[PDB]
Specification:
With 135 residues, this protein is an alpha/beta fold. 35% of the residues lie in helices and 27% in strands. It has one domain: Rossmann fold, CATH 3.40.50.10610. It comes from Escherichia coli (strain UTI89 / UPEC).
């Protein structure tokens, strides 16, 4: 699964996109596996976290602070992320401007990566991309 080669074009696309302000603090949600099959979410997630940090064009909420904010908020430590309402709560607690969703959907062999950038203040999705993912 060449995550990186799917994600780099998408992150860039997102950066170029109308309504996305760079240098924003970004609560980065775990990549949701909604394929018909199974894959490692964590390999995908880390690559994505990695992609958004290179080249310092987004600040990310650290996973520790995230877990801390859940304790604060009374939520389960590794149930990341809750609903839109839950993630908003967390985002606002930490100082986050966007929350970034991502999912691998469709065919577990040859899946599509889907990202949505939600604006925390309005709950409004202000960008989305879809990308093919290809070994």
């Amino acid at each position: 699964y060449d995550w990186n080669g799917a994600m780099q074009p998408m992150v860039s696309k997102m950066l170029g996109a109308d309504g996305v302000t760079a240098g924003s603090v970004l609560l980065v949600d775990s990549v949701n596996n909604r394929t018909n099959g199974s894959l490692n979410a964590a390999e995908a997630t880390e690559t994505l976290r990695n992609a958004l940090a290179n080249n310092g064009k987004f600040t990310l909420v650290s996973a520790q602070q995230l877990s801390m904010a859940k304790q604060q908020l009374g939520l389960s430590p590794q149930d990341s992320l809750g609903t839109r309402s839950k993630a908003i709560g967390i985002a606002r607690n930490v100082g986050a401007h966007y929350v970034l969703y991502s999912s691998a959907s469709g065919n577990v062999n040859a899946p599509t990566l889907q990202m949505q950038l939600m604006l925390v203040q309005t709950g409004e999705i202000i960008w989305s991309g879809k990308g093919a993912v290809s070994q």
